[PDB]
Amino acid sequence: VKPNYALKFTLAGHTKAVSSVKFSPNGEWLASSSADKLIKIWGAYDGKFEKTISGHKLGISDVAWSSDSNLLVSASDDKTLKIWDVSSGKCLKTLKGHSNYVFCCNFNPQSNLIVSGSFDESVRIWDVKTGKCLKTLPAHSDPVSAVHFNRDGSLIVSSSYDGLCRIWDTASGQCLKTLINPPVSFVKFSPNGKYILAATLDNTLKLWDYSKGKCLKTYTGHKNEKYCIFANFSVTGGKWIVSGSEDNLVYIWNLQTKEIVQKLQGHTDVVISTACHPTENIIASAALENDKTIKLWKSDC
Numbered sequence: 001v002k003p004n005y006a007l008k009f010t011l012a013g014h015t016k017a018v019s020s021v022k023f024s025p026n027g028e029w030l031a032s033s034s035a036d037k038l039i040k041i042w043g044a045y046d047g048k049f050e051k052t053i054s055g056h057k058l059g060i061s062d063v064a065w066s067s068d069s070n071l072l073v074s075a076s077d078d079k080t081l082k083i084w085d086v087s088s089g090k091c092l093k094t095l096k097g098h099s100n101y102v103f104c105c106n107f108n109p110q111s112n113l114i115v116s117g118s119f120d121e122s123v124r125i126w127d128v129k130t131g132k133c134l135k136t137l138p139a140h141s142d143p144v145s146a147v148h149f150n151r152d153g154s155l156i157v158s159s160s161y162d163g164l165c166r167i168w169d170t171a172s173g174q175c176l177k178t179l180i181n182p183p184v185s186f187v188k189f190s191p192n193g194k195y196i197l198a199a200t201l202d203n204t205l206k207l208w209d210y211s212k213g214k215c216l217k218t219y220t221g222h223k224n225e226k227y228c229i230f231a232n233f234s235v236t237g238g239k240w241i242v243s244g245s246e247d248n249l250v251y252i253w254n255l256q257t258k259e260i261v262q263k264l265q266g267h268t269d270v271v272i273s274t275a276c277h278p279t280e281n282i283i284a285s286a287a288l289e290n291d292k293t294i295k296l297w298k299s300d301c
């Protein structure tokens with residue numbers, strides 16, 4: 001009926017705003033990115049600081065893991081993405097081509113491709129092995145806020161401040177659907193690929209049916225009018241939607257009923273990012289400059 005997330009650890013180390021937190025697919029690590037130009041790696045279970053990964057020339061908006069947990073990609077205001085070997089901390093490739101800040105990034109499940117979105121209004125698809133751009137999609141008419149591959153890698157969903165979410169065939173780059181306009185600040189496919197979760201800067205999350213192009217559920221009660229705040233499908237226990245919020249709380253909703261089931265109190269600034277652990281009922285959350293911490297929470301269900 002309700003989870004009971006409780007605070008387990010508070011982590012500190014970044015020196016400017018955190019932008020993203022992500023658990024590795026193998027469950028071992030949490031990665032964080034920051035405006036301080038750094039990626040930090042932390043133990044997923046006890047929060048133990050592991051390493052700092054450095055090389056970008058300006059702040060980082062997003063980081064994402066390869067499926068085997070060995071690689072990270074980061075998206076930076078320096079107009080590049082970087083592919084990193086996590087074990088060595090070394091930059092393997094610098095992905096050059098965007099003409100403005102890179103805001104979002106993700107590997108496909110196969111992890112042979114990366115997708116990126118930029119302030120330059122394009123979505124790019126990159127070959128991981130060569131580090132070269134394969135396609136540039138003229139995807140949007142305003143900054144691209146999120147990019148995500150579906151469960152088998154065959155489709156990409158993008159979102160933009162232009163108010164649109166677009167679905168693309170990965171192999172051909174063709175736009176198969178546009179969901180119709182408040183700025184869309186985040187989007188991702190549901191685990192089964194049939195639905196799309198989208199955040200808009202009007203304090204609203206929406207669950208869309210891809211095949212019907214129609215909104216099925218809305219989730220409200222939180223505050224989101226300014227920042228790029230991701231939303232997650234929590235699937236290890238009860239089926240929830242999880243999101244940060246501009247009122248310093250983590251919100252958790254019942255996916256089916258849309259009711260709020262928990263609000264996590266503890267942060268002292270906007271909760272800018274949350275992530276859900278792949279096997280345990282564990283949430284990571286990060287707050288802005290008045291707070292400066294990442295918090296790890298645990299629920300029994």
Ligand SMILES: O=C(O)c1ccc2c(c1)ncn2C1CCCCC1
Binds near residue numbers: 193194195216217255
């Ligand atoms: O695993 C998934 O991707 C997934 C996606 C939507 C799911 C689900 C699982 N279980 C129930 N739903 C509802 C949510 C509200 C309407 C759509 C059906």
